[PDB]
Symmetry: none
Subunit: 135 residues, 5 copies
């Protein structure tokens, strides 16, 4: 069935780049996207992550058409990240330049047009860690 | 002296609405405009269920901004279409209508006056000229 | 009670435009595509002759409330300048799908063409792709 | 089996206005388009000062067109902004509002029904299924 | 500025021509091609007389100082292409799929250097060429 295999994460100095890759087994209006989880938010300011706070949805980073003709970017990564697709091989790519400590997160490839909201995603990869130095 | 006084904070359930107000007085500097920033709760970076360490020093995130006339507005994309920023230039007062509130919107909201604001360019907290003292918004899940 | 548009024209795909409507309740921008030869037979016929006047963005008279069609919410921003009694539409990262005639409208948030009370003449917006 | 009856012709001075009407009766015309064509004067293409020979051609050129179902409009560019085509689905009538008339707008104007418009280019007289009898518009200089 | 046209001629319908315009400088701002296919017998008496002899030259195509903006008469769109080589001091009109109705005297036109927009109206022309004949066959 549908399998999404992420590669290309790691540790990188602030200002550096990475290229994430997601190869999609057998499936896909439609498109793919990259989401990221920078961590749960303490929506109570008590010092702990508990209850309703573990439901912080993964945040949209970039998405792309099945055709590749449509793209959308989270506004804090526009101009620094470029999403692209090679339908021919199984793969979608996120070029990430000018990386910031704020970009540290678990990045997740997503497949369903230009998918943007987590609920609107059907299939998820298991995620890959990106940890940028705090410079 | 220029001063910004905020109001309209509230506690509502998810899906509700609020409207924050910021009243500007004194010698507003005419160019640029005003904006709302917010300090939400902090992120469990290393995923240990706690908040500590590098997860403690805080940074205010831009939410919306508006020119003094009101003709140019700009939004953080996670609030676009839910929040509306407006100005009553007469009363030198700026408003943030907040619809379809979400738990993640819980934060201290700070009004700001910034001579360097312009739509389409990110508005930096470090470039703000005057700050309000903040009002609490809490959205229950 | 007139409404006069300004600021349309041709633009590269990915570029930006700012539209203006000056008046003389709330206001809104609608858009209507030109004929599309769907079945690509060289003619315009049947359902291809029907073009919806679609809602894009709307704003209350005070500017305190806005609404957007979901496909344009990320790229269009609507705003109001009272005193000059003028409404703006900032349009960024435009795509060829955005090619259409854009109509400013006013009504005594306005969301549907049947609720419009006054219409501008329209301004052509063309995105190159 | 479309019958088209035109009205509204006249004689006005440059700068004036008229409104042509075309009343439509018959079958399927609401599933297609309607248009106004005009036959301006002959062109003295060899510059001898009169009209003769091949110059006696009544070229009927598209001026304005409309989809009956949705009301989309298209105009010859020399009349855009001055002319407005519209239709009233209750009265089965099409209109051509002509403002800021000019001597060059003098012509016989013909209402036309067509099932299809050409895509990307102007619809031609030979593409019309049914025609009205023609209505004279004369604009003085 | 002085404008001089070239590239006119006599061509079978369906053929092509390229008109060229050389100016003293572009120094010229926006530029355009106009054409006069002939006076129209507006009062239908068979003569040409009176105001009928005043008929303005018709806009065909126009181009910005920089060449980044163009406009066309709708009956030539997709057939004609206007271009500008400010280095070589030349403005061109490629004319494909020519029709008999395209027969006319074609005139190069220019506005002053700082009206850099697209020229679309005769009243907005500052300087005119003397014109070049184009004649397209039927059979
Ligand atoms: Tb907590
Ligand atoms: Tb922690
Ligand atoms: Tb820490
Ligand atoms: Tb954002
Ligand atoms: Tb078709
Ligand atoms: Tb003759
Ligand atoms: Tb024309
Ligand atoms: Tb005569």
């Amino acid at each position: 069935q549908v399998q999404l295999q992420e590669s290309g994460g790691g540790l990188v100095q602030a200002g550096g780049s990475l290229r994430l890759s997601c190869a999609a087994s057998g499936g896909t209006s439609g498109g793919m996207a990259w989401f990221r989880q920078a961590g749960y938010i303490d929506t109570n300011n008590d010092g702990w992550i508990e209850g309703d706070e573990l439901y912080k949805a993964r945040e949209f980073a970039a998405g792309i058409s099945w055709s590749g003709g449509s793209t959308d970017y989270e506004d804090s990564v526009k101009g620094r990240f470029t999403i692209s697709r090679d339908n021919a091989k199984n793969t979608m790519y996120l070029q990430m330049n000018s990386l910031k400590p704020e970009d540290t997160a678990v990045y997740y490839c997503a497949a369903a047009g230009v998918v943007t909201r987590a609920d609107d995603v059907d299939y998820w990869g298991k995620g890959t860690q990106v940890t940028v130095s705090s410079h």
